[PDB]
């Protein structure tokens, strides 16, 4: 019957909810007390990352039935406390697919040509031709680990660069991935073939440290790695060791095991390109997530 939008949402969110017969209250940056007070007669709550849906908030909101996040990450929602009260938690990973795939492709191009490091060099007044000699993507092999929507979108874009796209996903059939030009091979056969590796999986026990000391050792010397999915899929200590030896020639990281990362060794490495988790940070993705969460309600 009534939904509280507690973060900054595109007006489309409220209008879809209102067209569906729901009463909508839109407020921003409420204190814990104001949040609890607004939620008393709300069965629904829509957030982005700013609102903290803690155990204290859920337990004080007796009429609450669903917490909806317009985006991917639900670190601001207490999943345990929501499940403790029988509350369902919804999100919109689909709304962020295109923007995350586009950033991943940008990162691949940045690893081949070191555009971020070359800009920093130019801004320091330097003209370093030899230092930034790079590589051509045409004809190189891209290994895509995770063949859901984001992996598929990365594949079709990088195929236009003449990259050979191979990969693996234990959920996606070889017939489905063949339909978008991705040949699946057993995971052990992927490592030695790749010039570039990108990860597009959820973070689970089976995907934690997918890239680790053992799998980096199976890679071609000078592999370049991208993680625009979730911090922890690439083991950060193993990645630093691989960068230190040259086993990994460069890495691009939008995500970290700890955000912001307190260990700065990866961010500070000359062959590491990084962003502060910008995969979903476009007006288009934010508007799409807002629409998708209101449709779900």
What is the longest distance spanned by two Cα atoms in the chain?
Answer: 65
| Shortest distance, position 145 Cβ to ligand K58, whole Å | 4
DSSP for residue 130: G
Which tokens is 16 given?
């879809």
Q: Which of 146, 250, 279, 290 binds ligand K58 (CB under 6 A)?
A: 146
Between 83 and 119, CB nearer to a copy of itself: 119
* Closest residue to bound ligand K58 by CB: 148
Whole-number Å distance between alpha carbons of 145 and 96: 18
What does 145 bind: a copy of itself, ligand K58, none (CB cut-off 5 to 8 Å by kind)?
A: ligand K58
Other CB atoms within 10 Å distance of the CB of residue 130: 5
What does 21 bind: ligand K58, a copy of itself, none (CB cut-off 5 to 8 Å by kind)?
A: none
* 90 part of the interface to a copy of itself, by CB under 8 A: no
Contacts with a copy of itself, 3-32, as mask; x by CB under 8 A: -----x------------------------
| Shortest distance, position 176 Cβ to ligand K58, whole Å | 9
What does 168 bind: ligand K58, a copy of itself, none (CB cut-off 5 to 8 Å by kind)?
A: ligand K58
* 69 part of the interface to ligand K58, by CB under 6 A: no
Alpha-carbon torsion, ordered 131, 137, 140, 146, to 10 deg: 110
Ordered alpha helix ranges (H), 140-248: 149-159, 174-178, 187-190, 213-218, 236-245
On the CB side of 145, how many CA atoms lie within 13 Å of its CA?
Answer: 29
Does residue 255 contact residue 229 with C-beta atoms inside 8 Å? yes
Q: Which stretch binds a copy of itself (CB under 8 A): 126-134, 141-149, 218-226, 233-241?
A: 126-134
Which tokens is 23 given?
């009463």
Contacts with ligand K58, 169-188, as mask; x by CB under 6 A: xxxx--------------x-
DSSP for residue 28: -
Does residue 229 contact residue 201 with C-beta atoms inside 8 Å? yes
Other CB atoms within 10 Å distance of the CB of residue 292: 21
Contacts with ligand K58, 74-113, as mask; x by CB under 6 A: -------------------x--------------------
Does residue 128 contact residue 121 with C-beta atoms inside 8 Å? yes
* 283 part of the interface to a copy of itself, by CB under 8 A: yes
Contacts with ligand K58, 199-228, as mask; x by CB under 6 A: -xxx-x-xx--x------------------
68: nearest Cα among 138, 16, 144, 142: 16
| Shortest distance, position 150 Cβ to ligand K58, whole Å | 5
* 150 part of the interface to ligand K58, by CB under 6 A: yes
Task: Write out the binding residues for a copy of itself, residues 156-215 only, by CB under 8 A.
Answer: 156-157, 159-162
Give how far Cα 58 sits from Cα of 24, 86, 149, Å: 19, 10, 32
* Residues engaged in binding a copy of itself (CB under 8 A): 8, 98-99, 102-103, 105-107, 109-110, 112-113, 115-123, 125-130, 132-138, 156-157, 159-162, 259-260, 264, 267-268, 273-278, 281-286
């Amino acid at each position: 019957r009534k939904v509280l939008i507690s973060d900054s949402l595109d007006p489309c969110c409220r209008k879809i909810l209102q067209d569906g017969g729901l009463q909508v209250v839109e407020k921003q940056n409420l204190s814990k007390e104001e949040l609890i007070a607004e939620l008393q007669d709300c069965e629904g709550l829509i957030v982005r990352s700013a609102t903290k849906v803690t155990a204290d908030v859920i337990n004080a909101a007796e009429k609450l039935q669903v917490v909806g996040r317009a985006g991917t990450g639900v670190d601001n929602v207490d999943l345990e406390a929501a499940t403790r009260k029988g509350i369902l938690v919804m999100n919109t990973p689909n709304g962020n697919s295109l923007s995350a795939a586009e950033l991943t492709c940008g990162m691949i191009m940045c690893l081949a040509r070191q555009i971020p490091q070359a800009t920093a060099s130019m801004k320091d007044g330097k003209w370093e031709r030899k230092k930034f000699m790079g590589t051509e993507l045409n004809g190189k092999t891209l290994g895509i680990l995770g063949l859901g929507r984001i992996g598929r979108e990365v594949a079709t874009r990088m195929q236009s660069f003449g990259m050979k796209t191979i990969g693996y996903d234990p959920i996606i059939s070889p017939e489905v991935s063949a339909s978008f030009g991705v040949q699946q091979l057993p995971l052990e056969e992927i490592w030695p073939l790749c010039d570039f590796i990108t990860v597009h999986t959820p973070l689970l026990p089976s995907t934690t440290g997918l890239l680790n000391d053992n799998t980096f050792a199976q890679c071609k010397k000078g592999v370049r790695v991208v993680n625009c999915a979730r911090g922890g899929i690439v083991d950060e200590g193993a990645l630093l060791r691989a960068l230190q030896s040259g086993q990994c020639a460069g890495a691009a990281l939008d995500v970290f095991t700890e955000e912001p990362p307190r260990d700065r060794a990866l961010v500070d490495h000359e062959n590491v390109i990084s962003c502060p988790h910008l995969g979903a940070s476009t007006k288009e993705a934010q508007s799409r997530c807002g629409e998708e969460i209101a449709v779900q309600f």
